[PDB]
């Protein structure tokens, strides 16, 4: 037998998600608290969304790591889906930095080395996750990473790729200049991301797409001068032009300045 | 309350979810749309 929705007592709800509320929800038999995404399967049709919604389910279905949002299971009735997911307690990451403005070394660095750390797991399974940005990111229960929505993710086994996807500050040059890209995509995004939490801006922001598309593929990177050196190095690192010199996601976790701010901690496993 | 005290006591015993969850047979991707 699976799940239905009388397995479980609703709680509360958590906020809108992509295509679909989100809601606090025990299950009953396990009393086991979870998220739970409910989308509606004509809304989800009538929008064209069905093969879109099916690749993000069949990806990040067979996840499993501490720093990427856990899908336990997932069932449907009559007139919706839905999603059993992980609950993330702290929320919102992109929230903790638009109410902190930017963040510090320590809570950057832990959050990079979570973020190579996933990203390592999805790469060794040919998985690309195209869109890391705040936004798709939530925190455990001890503030810990979550990568959370996979929307523009692609198992990617061998032929490189050619959609221009993401979002705009995120895009490495690759993308704007129309060549295909590889999995190297996401090691740029993780340089704008580490930037932005730093400096609570993305590094090439500016008031048009054009002049931004040209402030990436000159990469022109500034640095503001309350940054460590380390940091610095480490940006600078993986914001590279040519996707092959991009530091390693190994290389970010091994990188000394990860090391020394990182505070990460290991949520307990079963057993 | 003690939603929050229950949310502290899943982080630190966690169940067997690949077991408890990962065993249950779901719908095909086919039959969802
Ligand atoms: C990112 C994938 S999605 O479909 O867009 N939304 C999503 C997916 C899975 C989830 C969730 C969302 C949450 C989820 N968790 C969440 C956890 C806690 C809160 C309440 N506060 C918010 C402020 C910080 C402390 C906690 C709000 C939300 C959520 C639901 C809806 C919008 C934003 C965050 C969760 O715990 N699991």
């Known amino acids: ?30 009393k086991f608290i979870m998220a739970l995404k409910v989308l509606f399967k004509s809304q989800l ?13 069949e990806i990040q279905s067979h996840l499993r790591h501490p720093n990427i949002l856990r899908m336990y299971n997932y069932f449907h009735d009559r007139k919706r889906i839905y999603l059993m997911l992980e609950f993330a307690p702290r929320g919102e990451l992109y929230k903790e930095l638009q109410k902190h403005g930017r963040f510090d070394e320590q809570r950057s ?25 705040p936004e798709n990111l939530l925190m455990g229960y001890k503030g810990e990473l979550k990568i959370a929505d996979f929307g523009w993710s692609v198992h990617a086994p061998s032929l490189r790729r050619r959609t221009m996807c993401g979002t705009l500050d995120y895009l490495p040059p690759e993308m704007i200049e129309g060549k295909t890209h590889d999995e190297k995509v996401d090691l740029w995004c993780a340089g704008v991301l580490c930037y932005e939490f730093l400096v609570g801006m993305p590094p090439f922001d500016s008031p048009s797409h054009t ?21 610095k190095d480490l940006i600078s690192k993986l914001l590279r032009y040519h996707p092959p010199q991009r530091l390693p996601l190994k290389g970010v976790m091994e990188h ?14 079963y057993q | 309350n003690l939603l929050t005290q ?19 047979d779901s719908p095909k991707l086919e039959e969802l749309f």
Not at chain 1, 109 to 129: G, N, Q, S
Not at chain 1, 217 to 229: G, I, M
């Open chain 1, 1 to 30: 037998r699976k799940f239905t929705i009388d397995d479980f007592d609703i709680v509360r709800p958590l906020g809108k998600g992509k295509f679909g509320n989100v809601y606090l929800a025990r299950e009953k038999q396990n």
């Open chain 1, 45 to 57: 049709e009538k929008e064209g969304v069905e093969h879109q919604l099916r690749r993000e389910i």
């Open chain 1, 109 to 133: 660095a832990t959050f990079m080395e979570e973020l190579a750390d996933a990203l390592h797991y999805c790469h060794e399974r040919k998985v690309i996750h195209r869109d890391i940005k």
């Open chain 1, 256 to 269: 000394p300045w990860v090391k020394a701010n990182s505070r990460r901690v290991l949520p307990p496993v």
């Open chain 1, 211 to 231: 002049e931004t598309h040209r402030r990436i593929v000159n990469v022109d990177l500034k640095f503001p001068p309350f940054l460590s050196d380390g940091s």
């Open chain 2, 6 to 24: 229950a949310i502290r006591q899943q982080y630190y015993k966690p169940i067997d979810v690949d077991r408890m969850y990962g065993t249950i």
